[PDB]
Amino acid sequence: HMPSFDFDIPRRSPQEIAKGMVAIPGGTFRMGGEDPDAFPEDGEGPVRTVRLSPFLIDRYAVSNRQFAAFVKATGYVTDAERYGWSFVFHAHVAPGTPVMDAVVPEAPWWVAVPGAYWKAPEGPGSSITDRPNHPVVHVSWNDAVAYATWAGKRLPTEAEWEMAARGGLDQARYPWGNELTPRGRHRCNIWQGTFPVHDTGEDGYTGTAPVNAFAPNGYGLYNVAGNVWEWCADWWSADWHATESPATRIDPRGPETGTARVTKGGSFLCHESYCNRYRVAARTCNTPDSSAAHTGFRCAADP
């Protein structure tokens, strides 16, 4: 990818860049999944051994406070602002808010809301004053790359994201192991109840949670499962990674072309009855200038 920016890249020291990041040592892990109920068109498989070079990855998704600092320093205008609208979950749109009649095929719970963007996540009249340490949302893949580059970082590849999210466990279902709520404790912010009609908020949150909510995984990362989808660097495909080759097994970058970029981790809207995509092997995609109330990102860096 060759992005274009209207701000200069500031100088930063290695110690500044590494703050809030964990160092993942070079090594191998088993990427992918073989859950029999996986949508075969997501390409969760095959399970494969991948070798990665050492990298740094953020413990937390990028927060509102951090994104605000980026925008203050650069004047950056997000894709949602240029388009003038972004996607908000229906239950979060305040009655009377102007809404577009647009329908996302097969997903009528999404509402295109003029004026919804990172600083007004539910549209005009909403704010992030009470959400400084929540993940920034309504950020597109382009916005994420812009932030990451300004910060001296980059987006993780899907394999880097998944190695870090797995937190040192071999082929577990979730970042922490194989039970969704071990010892009856909620470990991530997803949906409980009847999707899309009623979220019971059993896990504490019916929207985003702070980036440091819940216990971390074994590598110190927080909310890799649930909370917000997280953009990764790779172009999406369902089958590029089915090939056995150095390109797909050593520091894999994904296909060289595509139309949508990979997103990982699931969000506060995920539920087993619909999209069971908070499993660490799960994956989906979105087009790179798209944005939504349940999608953000975390950064990676070369040491």
Binding site: F39, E41, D42, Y83, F87, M100, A102, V103, V104, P105, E106, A107, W110, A112, W229, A260, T263, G266, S267, L269, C270, Y274, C275, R277, T284, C285, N286, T287, D289, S290, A292, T295
Partner: peptide, 14 residues
């Protein structure tokens, strides 16, 4: 009925 949708795209509404 079809693959569940988690990522709503700007193109999808056109």
């Amino acid at each position: 009925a079809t693959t569940p949708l988690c990522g709503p795209s700007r193109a999808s509404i056109l």
